[PDB]
Amino acid sequence: KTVVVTTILESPYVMMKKNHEMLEGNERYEGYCVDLAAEIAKHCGFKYKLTIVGDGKYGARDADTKIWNGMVGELVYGKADIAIAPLTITLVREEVIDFSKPFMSLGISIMIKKPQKSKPGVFSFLDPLAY
Amino acid sequence: IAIAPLTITLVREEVIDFSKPFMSLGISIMIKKPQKSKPGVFSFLDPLAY
Amino acid sequence: TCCLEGNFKGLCKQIDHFPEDADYEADTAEYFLRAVRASSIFPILSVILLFMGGLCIAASEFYKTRHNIILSAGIFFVSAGLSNIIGIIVYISANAGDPSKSDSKKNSYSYGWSFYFGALSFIIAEMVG
Amino acid sequence: MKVGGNLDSKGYDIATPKGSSLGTPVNLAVLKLSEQGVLDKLKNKWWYDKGECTSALSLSNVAGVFYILVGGLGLAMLVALIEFCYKSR
What we know:
In chain A, 18% of the residues lie in helices and 22% in strands. By secondary structure, chain A is of the alpha/beta class. Chain C has helices spanning 28-39, 41-62, 68-95, 113-128. It is classed as transport protein.
């Protein structure tokens, strides 16, 4: 049957279409993974259905009960056959599910408030001395 | 086992197995390190804009 | 401003002098300078003063006994030169606001012949004055 | 704004249940897209194509002195004409 593809809502990976209220099917969502899931489908020649995870979480092992949620939890227990999402490749997730080669390389970066250039005052030549 | 800077490509995956990339890279630009250029003939007008 | 050597070459997009995209006002002086540039009041005033000086010179021939007309023409020419100077200063100052019209190190903006026509117009008007 | 380079290296991968028939074909597909440049184009489309965004003293630093100079020239001219008109009258 159609392959169920679990996905998490995150811009610009997947977002909501402008007319998604009237739209139905996989066309309801647009984003990076929407086309990413499309390109793999044509190459592998299969039909896919895009679905959003119920809990809206990426996935993390719960040490108390040993339960997996999110992308990985759906895959291990069989709700979905493939996850098309910005899922980080980690050691804990690799021993549970299969990760392909990375399609996007990232890392920790620094965000700062960019300066708004500079607008010298008209009478800024009087700056060296006080009023 | 091949422990060497071997690029992961499509044709190699179809034939052998690669692990996850232990180092990420791409094409960059090499330029000569800029140095103090010889001052222009009319370089005394530099402090003020044209 | 019209596109050059581009896909949409020939498209003369109007210059927006009030970039209210971020809804910012900053200080009153910046708004006043932006309004002064947008109306182009000083180059237009220079044109008007040059026209008045020319008409005074033309009317000076008709009224030979009235020497005060020639003085008025000279005053108009000098004021036109001063207004042209103010217009050039305001134009360059407002141009410094946007990175494309500034940062000559990387952008390497170039002044066209139309700008130098106004620069030459100021010199001639002062010479005639 | 973003400054500098990445502190570390990570990646996003396509997740597939262990022991699945879609494991190998998807892995080959991902590399094929990267080799062809489809992934780079998709990143560009959803980040930049759909995005929403010297040393010498400039004239802006000394514009006020120019304004003062021209205002003084105008005031001096006005004074001269006022004096001339008063003398003539």
